[PDB]
Structure prediction request, 2046 residues.
Amino acid sequence: HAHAPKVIVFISGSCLFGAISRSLFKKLPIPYTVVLLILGAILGVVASNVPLVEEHTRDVAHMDPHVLLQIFLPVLIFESAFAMDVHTFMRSFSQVCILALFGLVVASVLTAVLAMNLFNYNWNFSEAMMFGAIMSATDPVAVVALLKDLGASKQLGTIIEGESLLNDGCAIVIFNVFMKMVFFPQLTSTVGQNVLYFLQVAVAGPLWGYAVAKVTVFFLSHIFNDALVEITITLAATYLTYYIGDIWLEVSGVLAVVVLGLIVNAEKTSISPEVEVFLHRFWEMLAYLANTLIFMMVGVVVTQKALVAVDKMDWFYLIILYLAITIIRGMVISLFSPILSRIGYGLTWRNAVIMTWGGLRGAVGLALALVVENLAGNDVIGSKFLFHTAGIVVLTLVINATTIQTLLRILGMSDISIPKRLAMAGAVRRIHEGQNRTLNMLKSDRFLADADWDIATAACEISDPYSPSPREFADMMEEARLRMLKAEKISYWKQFEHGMLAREALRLLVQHAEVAADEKDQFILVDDLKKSWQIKGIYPWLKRKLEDLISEKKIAMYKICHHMAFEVTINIAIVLNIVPIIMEFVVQDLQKIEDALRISNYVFFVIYAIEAIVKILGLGRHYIVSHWNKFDAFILVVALVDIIIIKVVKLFRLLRGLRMLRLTKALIPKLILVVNGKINNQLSLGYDVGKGYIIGEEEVGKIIDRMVDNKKILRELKHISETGRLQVVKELGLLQREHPGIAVSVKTRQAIRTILNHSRETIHELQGAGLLDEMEAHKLELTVEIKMKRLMNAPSSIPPPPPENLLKNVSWLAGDMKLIDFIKARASLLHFDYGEVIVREGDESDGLFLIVSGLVKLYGKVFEDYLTVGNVIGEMGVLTKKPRNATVTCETTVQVYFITAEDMNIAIDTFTLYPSLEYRLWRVVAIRIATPLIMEQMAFQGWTQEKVKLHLERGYLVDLAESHFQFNIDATLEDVILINGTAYNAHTREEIRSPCLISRTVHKLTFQYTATEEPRLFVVRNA
Amino acid sequence: HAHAPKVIVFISGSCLFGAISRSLFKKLPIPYTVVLLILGAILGVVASNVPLVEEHTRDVAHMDPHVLLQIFLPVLIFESAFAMDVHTFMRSFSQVCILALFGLVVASVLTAVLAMNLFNYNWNFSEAMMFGAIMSATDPVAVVALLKDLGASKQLGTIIEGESLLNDGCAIVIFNVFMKMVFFPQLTSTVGQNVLYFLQVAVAGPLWGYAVAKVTVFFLSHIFNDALVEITITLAATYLTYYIGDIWLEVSGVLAVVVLGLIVNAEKTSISPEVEVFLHRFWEMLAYLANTLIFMMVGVVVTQKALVAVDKMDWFYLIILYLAITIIRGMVISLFSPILSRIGYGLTWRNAVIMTWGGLRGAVGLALALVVENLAGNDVIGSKFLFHTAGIVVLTLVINATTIQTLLRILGMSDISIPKRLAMAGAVRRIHEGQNRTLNMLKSDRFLADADWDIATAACEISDPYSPSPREFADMMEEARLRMLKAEKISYWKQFEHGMLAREALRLLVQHAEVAADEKDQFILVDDLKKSWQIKGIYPWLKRKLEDLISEKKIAMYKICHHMAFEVTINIAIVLNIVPIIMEFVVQDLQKIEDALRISNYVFFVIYAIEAIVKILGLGRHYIVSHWNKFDAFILVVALVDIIIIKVVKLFRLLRGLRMLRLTKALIPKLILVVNGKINNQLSLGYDVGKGYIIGEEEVGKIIDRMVDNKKILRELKHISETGRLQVVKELGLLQREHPGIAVSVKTRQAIRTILNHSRETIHELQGAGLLDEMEAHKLELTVEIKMKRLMNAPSSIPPPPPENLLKNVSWLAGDMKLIDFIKARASLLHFDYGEVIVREGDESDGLFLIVSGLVKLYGKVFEDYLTVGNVIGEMGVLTKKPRNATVTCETTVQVYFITAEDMNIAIDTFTLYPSLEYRLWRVVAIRIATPLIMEQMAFQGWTQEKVKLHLERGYLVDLAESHFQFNIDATLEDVILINGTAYNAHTREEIRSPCLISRTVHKLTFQYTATEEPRLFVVRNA
Prediction:
């Protein structure tokens, strides 16, 4: 049949040709795109003779320009943006913006001048600027792929990629401008019109993209368990944004799509992870299809109607143009180098050379050249444009793309560093050992004894891809420093893999560690981490001001005046009435429409009059005290004036202003929520990085004790770590005090994340045991994922709980309502000011302190520490009745719940059960004492501190009421720690001190009925 | 600009409307498709008045029929096929084929008769058959989703889905036929032409799809580390198959796409797993887009130009038609029920009612109705077709789709079974316990003490979604039987999750277990498992015959006559020459072409003459003995006759036949490989299921010893398990003997799979420790995945290794070339026939037997067992010098390497090192003895037998040369087992027997220097 969609044949053929090209030239240096161009040229030449191939090709090869752009360019641009590492892009944004915007301007201008002066085509400035804009387009994929693969200068890869993104967007903008100037020349517009056009293309585009992106992520964050909807929304958002911006609004669509991609890639937390991984490959595949189609269309067109108008001088011009554009890009990079060196990551001459050589052209330039070809028609301009663009693309893909690897080798950037080589060698050796063990296991299997082991061993073998004095003191200290940095990086990776750290915090910590590792005796100084948790003053200032604006404490039928429905109704009334207020006056700027709209205006005036009467008769004389109500009264005044009544054009403005401005009262709270959200993001990263650093320091300080030899260097390293940890904890406490609600929200979020992660772990564990079918386990996992996604929509400003809630949430006051009542009755609330001492070292343990507000410093004896809300001081005091262990000083205004030692003795005596109160207290103290010991003995193994704390949580405290000697049964036992008192090994009668871990070899423990030091011992069990 | 692609707006709008519909009506019973139809109707009515909306809609709403089909129908059909559970579909294929093909025929015929007689439209039979074909289309999604969710009658879900797939395909075929009969009426064709047309649509379609699918999977199985290529190949294959089949070949494209989807979904092992999971969602999303677009187009068209021609009687006809089609489907199901009950899964009346009520119509029927609308144009036929189709779709989506849940409730199918409720309750309780533990852990954290715990606890809470006598003896035996079945299912799931079982074997075992669990005292009888490993005689017969054909033992310049290049060259010559032999004669059926082709024919005759002279002068008088060479000589005879010369038309056939038939010699070996592949698949499933059953029986036989009480029922269960295991092992050994090479290939494949799985596990383990960066670990994982995918392309017929290789691959002869030489010198090869006894019980241990071929039965004293190739007999004999433990009887012709006890004593004495030969022997024996003990004590925990064997592999044998008493240090120790001799606990002097596991409580062991029973003890260590 004649009306078959022949485009399908061409599309699928391009797919298969791309498959063949990639498969065959996977290992060769020449990229597959050149093969696609050659195949397209062959296809075009054969079509020129065979009419059937012409029938199958014409539909796509001679496609309309607008179709080409509005289908392919959004795909290419959004795939480029959605592939970005947005965070390093933003941290190098100024550098990339300079290098991209100003670099494109200069390069395109110089290329246009070259085209006008060198070429004999006698082009005008508009056509030459079009040419330069096309030539300035860039394609980083083949170079950034290598830079990401080699791992050298990870910053350079993203600088190149983002520069390509931005220069491609701006090049498309410039191309559209000059294309409209040359092929659709309108009348010479006024300078004001040109300024408006500039604002419309350069400013309105990003704002349109930003609005669409924020709306898109808003909806995405409220879709649960519907992947198809999320993917469909993303796709439709991209295409609809481009179409609406470029056509309806005449706004720059490419920039809008760039902003949309960046914003969604940043807010990517709003997207379910599985559809995120789906979307990455989906957009990669769409971009691949677009690239293949564009290259094959270029081949067809260039062989059909471009080379026919090519002369000998054109080749010389092509060579000169290639050299010229290379030199121009190099000159631009070197010229801005003085500026870029002082901004962001800076530039080395090696990085600059890679940037200069790696500037490949690609699909964007070819698409624009095809547009020029279609628009020019019979004119030679299109032929020359397509010829030169394709020639330079071919040259870059043949010379630059193939020689970039050799250049990276020559400049010394491709060298794998020694640490990576050592890590790979160790991993390969461990893999070989595991494979040998598995082979030995299999050879013993009766059902596999006859298997050909030579073939198996050959098949499963994995190979290494990379295959007392000052000098001595300096060597030893460098060794210790590098080893500590490696241990810290390992700790951060372990923290992340178990879900305790977000990716951003891990990346910050790791990159800081690496930077410190290549700068003399530079450890990870806290000052660099400081910038993570430093809140810019703009957000706190805005919060303070805006919250002042909505402070109704001057004010706080009457029942309705303070009921929600009233405000909701009037808000809806204003928002609805705004639509007529726009439509009517724009229509005036048909009488049966105006009169009806003015009747509706009477109706809305009646609604406002009813509302004003409501407020007056409810709030009495207090109504007009509020400035908001003053504005409302002025609204009613204007309404009376203009309903009783230059008057017309006066009314058209007054009834717009007085009515549109009334919704700012409802707007401001949402703006406060936005400010809270940004502060929450910054504070969340601050907490993540600070806590990660503290935990890593704690783990490494006990790792190094067994892996660094000299005592003095060990002490120096410990001192450095302790100083950093103390500073970090103090800063985090002060931040908590500055913004209570945000800190509470962050901590609740972290708690929920941890609980849900461990719940998913339990689900997986009991699925592996086969106790749940895959489908039911999947259902439970779906519930977990839905809860986790709803977590992202937390209020972000949870009000701080009152002291009573903190008292009733203490670990050893969980449940047990009667004990909570007793303690709340006995407790007293004490307030202290800055610099005061709550309690001193050596004092008698007169009671507990539960910090309900503030921050305290704990000095002792080198024992400096900081405590904040929730922490309770003096448990050891009341339990063992020994003197105070530390001096408590307030670093800020502090409020503490004080419970006397006598009230604690009374509570302990009065409350007794299997979950004994004293049992709970000693359990908490014993876990806190035990965790450091278990890490000190076993931090060299893969256990994190979280694993140790959960391991102890599974344990129990030995009673010694049913016995007076403890047997290491090793069934229902995994490890033992002593806390209080002294014990003796039954057989050898060796002595164990109070805080000592029980050695593995020890068999049985003997105790004494010494009430003064009634021994307490902790045990953990396997099953 | 005017030439903007307005289709983009409509597509993206349909996307957003679908998103809104799904989001809003997620919980309501009404499906979102009805909402989409209503929205499309609103859009059409508003378009009829607003011309701009008409401009934006016309491009899609009034789309060409061919575009509609060739874009959407392939997507819908391939998504339906690629979503299939192909294996249960194939195991119910006959039932589905009856119910679908004959059911569609009857239903469509009856619907057409109803249309002709009831409706006043005065339709002819062609139009009525079109109507019936449209009405017969089905959409199971909303019902199969529930059946898969509830888990009741999993077979019913796939029966419905496959019936829908096949009936939709056949309905499209019938619609195409009658559409061509009515709207493109050609001249009345002859009956032979009709038969050819039937073969072309019904037969050639499936074959075209099969060929394309096999080629596609062939290419997919040779693409490594390129996801984009795989996805692009799949997409292009689907569309190109449909286009080529329907247009170029005029072959049924829908059936071709159905076969393509099924074959790819079956050969899905050829696809990289990540792109498999990508592709499932990709095709689901494409189908979703197609559905949304079709529904919105229906709304627009029906509101614009269909309802305008609707009358009151049409609604009555619609109601009558709905009732009629429902009754017809029910009648068809009940009428075929006698046949379907005796085929496959059968049918209950409840399942039949669900099938009758769940037959929803959908996108396919609407698309065909739109085709009829576009083709009919101004005729009322299109209006009536679209009206009735849309009305019935709406009615089914409103009545059937909403009431199917209530019907499943009424029929008692929605009830969750008690075991699932218990499993869910236990999982929820464990999750609550884990969350409470995590909460206790967090509350102790100093940095989270101030978090609002009420909010967290409320957020993280997961809730249960489902919220001595004959009578007593029968209850107890049922309890034990059900408990054993549950344990077996758990064992199968554990085996699968650790990668020891393929999914198919697990599903077979689990479904067999469930079937046995609901049928009186029916355990898992081996007879059901037998059909898994039973090879159909067709493949062995074909292998034997074809391998006989290529037996060149009559035959096996001369150097070239037996060199590969010769045969390769002549094969290429024939395949190349066939192309001219086709082109020239078809062109005859321009003279400058024929003469050149005949010169080329002379050239190829010269090549054949050179080849024949080659064979003659090389092979001498032996040349003509081979029948293949007789045919070759006859080829040369015909070539001479027709080159020297009715003659023309004689030549046109003779030079085709004699030349095309010569390539069968090269074809046959590949066909033998195909036969080997199918036998390999069947044998691989047989081994998987048999070994899984054996392992599950071994684990459950030791689980039950601690969880079933009465001794007699325990003995009965043990006897049943032992009988099943013995039969399974015997059958597997016999299968191995029948097909040696295939068994060797399967076992090598399993070994490589296990090794690579454990290597990936090690990579993940050391990544979690942070010892490798994510990128390098990803590189190693990529290498592992590439090796695993290449594993799928194994030869499948690895030749059996010779006895020397088996001797040099024994576990304790690994490496150590000198010992291998000694043993190969000392060893002797003995041959035994059926029924002979190699050695008897109580005999003196005179030497080892290594089975190099055959199968042996080991009787002893109730000790019946079977051993096969690779297994070695008599190790205990030579080590402990005790009498023979069992009687060895040959169940088939057996060959054994015999090494005398004296040679073993000499080898032991002569060879001594840290990896001592006696140490190796005792290590093997100790592991074999120890594994049962560790399972017997700890099979109740989550450990599988593989975990136990690896756990022992990490261990070592205690020397007792540096000491005579063993200390349970519990560091560098995890468990202890005794093997030989007797030991005593140092403190209590309690006695430990030779095979006993050392108790956890025991402290230290004391031994004796009794050489007669020199004690051997095994130890495993943690770190």
Summary: The CA atoms of residues 153 and 290 of chain B lie 30 Å apart. Residues 7-410 of chain B form a domain with the Na+/H+ antiporter like fold fold (CATH 1.20.1530.20). The longest strand of chain B covers residues 847-853.
